[PDB]
Amino acid sequence: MKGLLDFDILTNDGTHRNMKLLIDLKNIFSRQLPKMPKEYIVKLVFDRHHESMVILKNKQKVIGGICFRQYKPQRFAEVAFLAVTANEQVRGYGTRLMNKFKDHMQKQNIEYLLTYADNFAIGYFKKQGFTKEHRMPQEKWKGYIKDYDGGTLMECYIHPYVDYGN
Numbered sequence: 093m094k095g096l097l098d099f100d101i102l103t104n105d106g107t108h109r110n111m112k113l114l115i116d117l118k119n120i121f122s123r124q125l126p127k128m129p130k131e132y133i134v135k136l137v138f139d140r141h142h143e144s145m146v147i148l149k150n151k152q153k154v155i156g157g158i159c160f161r162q163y164k165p166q167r168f169a170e171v172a173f174l175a176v177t178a179n180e181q182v183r184g185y186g187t188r189l190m191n192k193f194k195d196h197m198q199k200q201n202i203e204y205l206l207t208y209a210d211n212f213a214i215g216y217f218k219k220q221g222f223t224k225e226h227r228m229p230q231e232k233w234k235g236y237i238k239d240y241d242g243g244t245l246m247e248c249y250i251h252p253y254v255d256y257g258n
């Protein structure tokens with residue numbers, strides 16, 4: 093594992109240091125992301141407890157990170173979103189999370205991911221493995237649940253025995 097970067101598992105339990113960093117992630121996304129609905133990332137990022145992995149460009153200097161939580165009886169999952177802060181990206185960190193996200197997506201047994209990704213995260217997701225397009229027409233984008241108007245109903249099919257990292 094090459095890279096001096098530091099990652100951390102945060103939660104919205106309401107501790108203290110976890111919040112400050114968790115906050116960074118929320119603004120980071122909604123920030124670079126065309127004024128995307130803040131409450132959205134906030135909802136998924138602070139959707140009760142939940143688990144997330146951030147980045148640290150100085151041991152505690154948040155820069156990137158992804159947050160999410162899959163549903164068991166639902167067999168579906170939602171991602172708070174991944175993304176490095178503005179003029180902090182283009183360094184090679186974010187991708188480290190997106191992949192870490194997949195490894196976990198399999199450790200939870202949930203493969204039916206979901207989000208309201210826009211052309212921005214769209215291509216960015218389809219690039220890291222995700223799939224913005226589904227067997228059904230895009231016209232069915234409305235109905236993915238949570239958040240109304242903002243991006244596009246994206247999904248991440250976490251098929252079994254897939255080459256994600258393990």
Ligand SMILES: CC(C)(COP(=O)(O)OP(=O)(O)OC[C@H]1O[C@@H](n2cnc3c(N)ncnc32)[C@H](O)[C@@H]1OP(=O)(O)O)[C@@H](O)C(=O)NCCC(=O)NCCS
Nearest residue numbers: 124174175176177178179181182183184185186212213216
């Ligand atoms: C997406 C991201 C994790 C990847 O960063 P990266 O691939 O290492 O490098 P980036 O190219 O993103 O670096 C930033 C610049 O590249 C562009 N860029 C942003 N996100 C990008 C991405 N996913 N892929 C390629 N280029 C991207 C931007 O124009 C940005 O311009 P600026 O910094 O001069 O204002 C990170 O750049 C980010 O958080 N961007 C904003 C959030 C976003 O787009 N989220 C959706 C993806 S899930």
